[PDB]
Write a structure and sequence with these properties.
mainly beta; Neuraminidase; four-stranded antiparallel beta sheet; 30 strands; about 45% strand; unknown function
Amino acid sequence: GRIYAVGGYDGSPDGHTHLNSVEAYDPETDTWSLVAPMKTRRSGVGVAVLDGRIYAVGGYDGSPDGHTHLNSVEAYDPETDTWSLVAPMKTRRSGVGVAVLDGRIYAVGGYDGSPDGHTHLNSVEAYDPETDTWSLVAPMKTRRSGVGVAVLDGRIYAVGGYDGSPDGHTHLNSVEAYDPETDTWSLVAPMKTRRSGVGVAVLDGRIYAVGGYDGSPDGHTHLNSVEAYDPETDTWSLVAPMKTRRSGVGVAVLDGRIYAVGGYDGSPDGHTHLNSVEAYDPETDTWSLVAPMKTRRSGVGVAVL
């Protein structure tokens, strides 16, 4: 019943660090509270909940010492308020999308290190907690980091993202769905807007794509816009926009609302790394700010436990 905000990058003047800290939001009281920190600093981290534990998967740490792209994974036990390392992924993945499907954690895309910079990934792996092992599954058609991942009706949707490889668009409006029965990805209808660093969540049978960055020629815009996908019609439609523009935003569903947590606002004026949090109600089609986090977090992972 709480939203956990995990890691991120606090680029604000007073923080200037990739984060190991964690905080939890209680909707009854409208408070954010301390949680035990992770062992590892991680921004661009994927987070999901499985069998009563939160998993923090991969991420990035720009500090010059040690690996900057992470394959490590840790699990939070709320009963002891402790984190423990579990098996690492086969691939280091920054800006990775993570979701839970049928008792497995899926890690989708991201970027790894290359001799010339970073390599954007189409590969996907899945974690079984019982054996503590990662296995490879089919890759996506498109390489995507900063990709939003959500599960609807037994399929994983990979929404938007950033493809830094040669050829093709860089900021993605495309969407592809993974069918576990056949271990294949298939394209579905693209979004109206290209969105790298997009947050997604599923509420009442629709996928919501929240915020992001449209770096395409007519854009160069940090987005407050939001769109929703209806799988019955295979169509995307705009809904009400957020109060604040946010890329690298964490999105979670709690108590019938979508929460947009943190992120990065590159528009003029106002803070750049965000501690603010807002909640969307589909019935009234409105967004409202709630209490802010104690720490500003771009590239934050969020999950509900």
